[PDB]
Amino acid sequence: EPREEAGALGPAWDESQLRSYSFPTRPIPRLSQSDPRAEELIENEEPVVLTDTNLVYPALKWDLEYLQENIGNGDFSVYSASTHKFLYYDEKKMANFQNFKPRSNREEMKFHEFVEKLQDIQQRGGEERLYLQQTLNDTVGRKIVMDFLGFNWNWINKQQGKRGWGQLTSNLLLIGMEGNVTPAHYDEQQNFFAQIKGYKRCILFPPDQFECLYPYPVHHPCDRQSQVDFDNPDYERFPNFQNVVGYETVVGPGDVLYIPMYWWHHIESLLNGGITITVNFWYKGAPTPEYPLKAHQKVAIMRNIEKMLGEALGNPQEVGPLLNTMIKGRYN
Amino acid sequence: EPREEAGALGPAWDESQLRSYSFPTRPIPRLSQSDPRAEELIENEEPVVLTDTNLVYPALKWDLEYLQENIGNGDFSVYSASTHKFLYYDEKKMANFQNFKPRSNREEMKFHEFVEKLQDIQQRGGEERLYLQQTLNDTVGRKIVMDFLGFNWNWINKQQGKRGWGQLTSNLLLIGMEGNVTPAHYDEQQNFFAQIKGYKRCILFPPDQFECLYPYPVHHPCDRQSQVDFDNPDYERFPNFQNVVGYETVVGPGDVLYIPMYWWHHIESLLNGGITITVNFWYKGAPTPEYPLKAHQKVAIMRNIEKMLGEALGNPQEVGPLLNTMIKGRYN
């Protein structure tokens, strides 16, 4: 049930703002950072929404005007799409899959250009959609630097230390239009996902649902993303998607969602909820040291077999036929 | 067409002595050792029957009486079966496949005990079948030692040297009853197969017919053997067996068949042809150093993936499910 905003400002959102899908879900726990149960969940690599970390407290005042004024003159990657779905793709892998035609295009622009573009669409009632996705770097201006330094490093540094994680590799700034969707995928880093403006519905699936989510081949540009179109699932090609069960939550300003490494996640900015802003914190996982093997360890194994086969065969497109030759009439 | 024995002793064998199968074949060339074409075939890892190597000339006089009298008091492995098919199995892998029940059993006995057993079956009109399969070692007696030293080492040592092969690992002595069959399999060593007594029909298939022959899983005891029952092929489980095409020949005393490493081979002692005797020469292949990859190199790759997965998963029975999880809805 949608939470009530403090001061009787009513429900933060309602059901009609959520897209409709074919599978059931259960709630991700929302807990205080001081609650032992929260620590237990993170330690066990299970998702949890933390409501009071103050992780990005200083960023809570951020909006397009403040960011335009203060984030510098560096380039920002902005994706443009004709659909609500911003399927991630790795440009470096496009050469090996000449027939992949991306539904979104990346354009590099200045922040004020992004803002102007957003304005032109609104005014001209356009259907175009934008999604800025840019790692925070040294070109940000003074006030942003001050804000960033005011993040709760004390709390997150202890988390990093407590879980044996590796280094912070980056902080991705995500600014999306209402209705934008990042289709289901998994990332190979640990993630504290800090919501700043607007609301995003996050649907997560544990690594043991690999068989239901059908990620692209490792050498395909959409490596790590699900092949299933959540809006029109093809059960003939992906029969186990009929067995998928998600963990879901809606995060708003001040909330931090822990998205454990290898956990699938689908993220959508609420319909009619205005623009959203998020900053993530990506950390490399702990070191690979016992049986029985965890699901995510089997996923790592599968990725490695795919990688080695591609290298040994000298052409990634030969991977499938060899794998098929290996299993038919022998293991299937 | 069956060859004519010198001295007008008539056809060495006839069609009625060959078992009937579902696939076509083409002949393996029969050539003189001095024929450049023979060298070309061996160099290219293609089968050839050599008719005049004199490789085991001194063994041509061998028969059960002479061997019983001279081969020593060492133990011989003798397989016993209720069927004509002597499917090879690796006893060390039986623990991991508790449900595999071998159709043949190994018994260790003295040569004279083997001979006596053969006699008892004949006399009692029994249906039991025996197949002695024993590596030649230091317990053989003086005359056998003399015979062995009289093999054409000059010719085979040059072959070994010319092809860059590794060491001779062993010489297997095979003594079978008429009608005995060694079902289709491939070996990971180079083989000069020297026929001594009786006739054996050899059907070979190139490594690129892997998809048609369906070898057992690597960790199964029947690793390297085909799962297809040539006498009653199950096309539902093994549909590409409908596409298999063999290379065949019948070898007799004095003939040497080169069976190149990784080439599938099915070997049968002619029906009603009396006992057969063969001595093979197994050599380790040359060293693994260019694209495109050869079929046998892809076979090596597949074996390696199976091996690594078994070790990484810690249970070979987990190999299949992981492989299936890898390919369904992703590569198939």
């Binding site: 925070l136 040294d138 995928h185 490399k284 790592a300 077999i305 | 990484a312």
Partner: peptide
């Protein structure tokens, strides 16, 4: 075989740990 990389939905200017230290 169990080893893993660190790929995410973003390409591989200081950032992450490097950005933070430079700033502090």
């Amino acid at each position: 075989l169990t080893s893993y990389d660190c790929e995410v939905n973003a390409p591989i200017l200081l950032q992450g740990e490097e950005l933070l230290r430079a700033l502090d």
